[PDB]
């Protein structure tokens, strides 16, 4: 049977095992997120989806927390807003100032969610981290100083494409995503890491520098390279 939870006081009937993020989606609220993809497994490491429950003293990860009976989810509370601001502060603290030279440009989730859920000023008075750029073939361009270590490409590669050639090497602030060796990530489903990477760490190499998202017009057609008809 369905259990009853509350999002901002509004009743939702959700199946057991539904997460806080999915319940908020059911009432129409999209919780901010970086590491969560609904086609991939649940990581819960970017900590961007933290929300407040009515009586809980601690924020929970909305993407990985199943709802319990009679929970009130405060999606726009002071605790949730401050949690989002802190997480965005850390991300932008180590991110590089590469927006004008970044193909992610006007279609970046770091930019959009920084304009929506983050602070408008920076307190970071230190030096930034610079990361060596890897090479994984002629299709995907890697500029890994922009990586936010969300591990979507690792989960996608492994689970979806059946290729376990991506991972995280090292630990701490110096943790890096790559192959650890000069190996090309060649697969029939390799551009989807370009799609799912929220930032400009993984970008299309044929499309590099040619256009900006606001310029383009979008035509909805189908694919003719095979008989799937994508």
């Amino acid at each position: 049977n369905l259990i009853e939870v509350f999002v901002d006081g509004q009743s939702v009937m959700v199946e057991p095992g539904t997460t806080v993020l999915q319940a908020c989606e059911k009432v129409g609220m999209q919780i901010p997120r970086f590491c969560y993809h609904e086609r991939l497994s649940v990581a819960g490491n970017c900590r961007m989806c933290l929300v407040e429950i009515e009586k809980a003293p601690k924020v929970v990860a909305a993407c990985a927390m199943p709802v319990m009976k009679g929970w009130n989810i405060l999606t726009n509370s002071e605790k949730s807003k401050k949690a989002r601001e802190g997480v965005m502060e850390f991300l932008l603290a180590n991110h590089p100032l590469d927006c004008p030279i970044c193909d992610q440009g006007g279609e970046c989730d770091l930019q959009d969610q920084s304009m929506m859920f983050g602070s408008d000023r920076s307190r970071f008075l230190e030096g930034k981290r610079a990361v060596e750029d890897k090479n994984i073939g002629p299709l995907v361009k890697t500029i890994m100083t922009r990586c936010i270590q969300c591990t979507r490409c690792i989960r996608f590669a492994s689970e979806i494409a059946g290729v376990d050639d991506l991972g995280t090497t090292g630990r701490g602030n110096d943790m890096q995503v790559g192959t650890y060796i000069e190996k090309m990530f060649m697969s029939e489903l390799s551009g989807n890491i370009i799609d799912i990477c929220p930032v400009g760490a993984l970008t299309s190499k044929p499309y590099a520098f040619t256009a900006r998202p606001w310029e383009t017009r979008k035509t909805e057609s189908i694919d003719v390279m095979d008989a799937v008809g994508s």
Binding site: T169, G178, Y180, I181
Partner: protein, 217 residues
Amino acid sequence: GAGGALFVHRDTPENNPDTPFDFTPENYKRIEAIVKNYPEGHKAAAVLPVLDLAQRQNGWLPISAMNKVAEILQVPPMRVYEVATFYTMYNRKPVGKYHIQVCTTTPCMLRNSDSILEAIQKKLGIKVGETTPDKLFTLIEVECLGACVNAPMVQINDNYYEDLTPKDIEEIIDELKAGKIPKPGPRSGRFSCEPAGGLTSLTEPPKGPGFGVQAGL
């Protein structure tokens, strides 16, 4: 503080997939013993023990050794690389015959650990991330090693030398380079963690079996 060791691999003549590495038959017996400590269908749990065994045999971990471990355990080489780069007890670079590791965290820093480090550096004439020209000693700093009450202390190839003074550590280095193996443990007249002034507890002989046992139990 930057570690100074990169987490990417570049093929070199001394370190490449064609580098000869394979376990000895005794080490294969040890691998077989290790693997059957875990449930069937979970053979990948032996990555850390088998990789440590490979490093124990070969002194360090070449990429060929990592690939051999991955092949034996049928686990992706990227998973083996992840483990090897994550854990700091693995040497992905050739190391000296004696790996001196001076603990420099606060409990050991409050006692004169900098004196120990400076004495080692002057005795060997190397910096704190370098190897001696004869490839005999390597010197690094490490975090807490679990002998805080016996501070300052160093670890030289899984032996703890504790309650050190500059003279004591110089004598230890001299014994190591001469050929003898110094006895591990405190150098300050203590045997273990007991207070130096005198035993403040456990002075009387222990009570026998069933001393204060319950009624029924």
